[PDB]
Amino acid sequence: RSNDKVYENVTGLVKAVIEMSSKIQPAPPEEYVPMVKEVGLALRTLLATVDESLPVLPASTHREIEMAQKLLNSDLAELINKMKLAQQYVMTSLQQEYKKQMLTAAHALAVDAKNLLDVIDQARLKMISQSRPH
Fold this sequence. Notes:
Layout: H1 5-24, H2 32-80, H3 82-88, H4 96-131
Helix pairs in contact: 1-2, 1-4, 2-3, 2-4, 3-4
């Protein structure tokens, strides 16, 4: 399997956090939250993909998708409260504390996208795993 829409969209999750990167470039803390909104739409769009991987859950994906999806649910979530936190502690010079807390968390959510990206890539391969011995 050449990593179906499953791998592609999860790449899009990272492309959503590159949105987060671009967002913060010209925009203020007001977009600290919209930028993470970009990565939130990432897991959202990903869930269209997880519904692809979902029929693959019975196939074999039930191993990955439990691990990575539950992982990213918790970590994407932290970023959406890191956008909350950043916009929650929005102060010209003091924000950076919550900024570096958002950054360190962003690295973690980057892993949640990245892990599911490969392991849901393996979801689609999980299906191949069922077709393999046939």
